[PDB]
């Protein structure tokens, strides 16, 4: 509350460390469905169904330009990529499996770097 604060967690490396995580996600062999925005002209149903499209290149641009206020808003966009994937793709598909795999990969790096 006013003049009453928990001890200050050092967040000075968060930007650099999110960048590193994102580099590792970008280079994963199963990243291919997520590298670029889904083409809304060429994929019927995507624009209407997926209200907030997100992809690794959009996260990279937001990160590089100071549009994440804190490490949680970063995690929320990474998770959005996978939530969108699950919304649109059957579990028993190459893309559906890719999304599950990458979400696992992410969640471990997130826990190991920050928890």
UniProtKB/Swiss-Prot annotation:
Organism: Homo sapiens (Human)
Compartments reported by the entry: Nucleus
Assembly information from the UniProt record: Component of the BRF-1 ISWI chromatin remodeling complex, at least composed of SMARCA1 and BAZ2B, which regulates the spacing of histone octamers on the DNA template to facilitate access to DNA. Within the BRF-1 ISWI chromatin remodeling complex interacts with SMARCA1; the interaction is direct. Component of the BRF-5 ISWI chromatin remodeling complex, at least composed of SMARCA5/SNF2H and BAZ2B, which regulates the spacing of histone octamers on the DNA template to facilitate access to DNA.
Similarity comment: family membership: Belongs to the WAL family.
Bromo domain location: 9-113
Annotated function: Regulatory subunit of the ATP-dependent BRF-1 and BRF-5 ISWI chromatin remodeling complexes, which form ordered nucleosome arrays on chromatin and facilitate access to DNA during DNA-templated processes such as DNA replication, transcription, and repair. Both complexes regulate the spacing of nucleosomes along the chromatin and have the ability to slide mononucleosomes to the center of a DNA template. The BRF-1 ISWI chromatin remodeling complex has a lower ATP hydrolysis rate than the BRF-5 ISWI chromatin remodeling complex.
Tissue: Expressed at varying levels in several tissues, whereas a smaller transcript was expressed specifically in testis.
Name of the protein in its database record: Bromodomain adjacent to zinc finger domain protein 2B
């Amino acid at each position: 509350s006013m003049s009453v604060k928990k001890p200050k967690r050092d967040d000075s490396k968060d930007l650099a460390l999110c960048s590193m995580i994102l580099t590792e996600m970008e280079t994963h062999e199963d990243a291919w469905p997520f590298l670029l925005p889904v083409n809304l002209k060429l994929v019927p149903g995507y624009k209407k169904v997926i209200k907030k499209p997100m992809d690794f290149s959009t996260i990279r641009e937001k990160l590089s330009s100071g549009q994440y206020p804190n490490l949680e808003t970063f995690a929320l966009d990474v998770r959005l990529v996978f939530d969108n994937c699950e919304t649109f793709n059957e579990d028993d598909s190459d893309i559906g499996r890719a999304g599950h795999n990458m979400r696992k990969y992410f969640e471990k790096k997130w826990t190991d770097t920050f928890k």
